[PDB]
């Protein structure tokens, strides 16, 4: 099947915009740490999560 791969990877590439705005690299992040969470969510992201989920 060719279509369901490319149908979701458009949406999946939008998902790494959340990762880039919350941490340095695209995929792997040193974000979850023994001290909880390394860095707080920026002001732009919290409005984007609701916009994505809709």
């Amino acid at each position: 099947a060719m279509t369901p791969f490319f149908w979701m990877f458009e949406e999946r590439e939008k998902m790494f915009e959340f990762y880039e705005r919350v941490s340095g690299a695209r995929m792997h992040a040193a974000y979850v740490r023994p001290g909880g969470v390394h860095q707080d969510l920026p002001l732009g992201l919290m409005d984007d999560i609701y916009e994505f989920s809709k």
């Binding site: 707080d40 969510l41 920026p42 002001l43 992201l45 919290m46 409005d47 609701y50 989920s53 809709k54």
Partner: protein
Amino acid sequence: XXXXXXXXXXXXXXXXXXXXXXXXXXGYSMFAVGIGALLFGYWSMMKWNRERRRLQIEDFEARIALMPL
């Protein structure tokens, strides 16, 4: 003043909603159009073959008419 990330939900995006529903086709109604197209198909086709018979006999008549050939 402290400024942090604010919470917003508004519509909650609707948690698990069905989008798949029956459209256009019902069941019995599709067979009325399906087999209905077949019955219309044969009746239209066979009338042309009867019109072909008008040409057919007339074509073979040319051979009988031509004896100097």
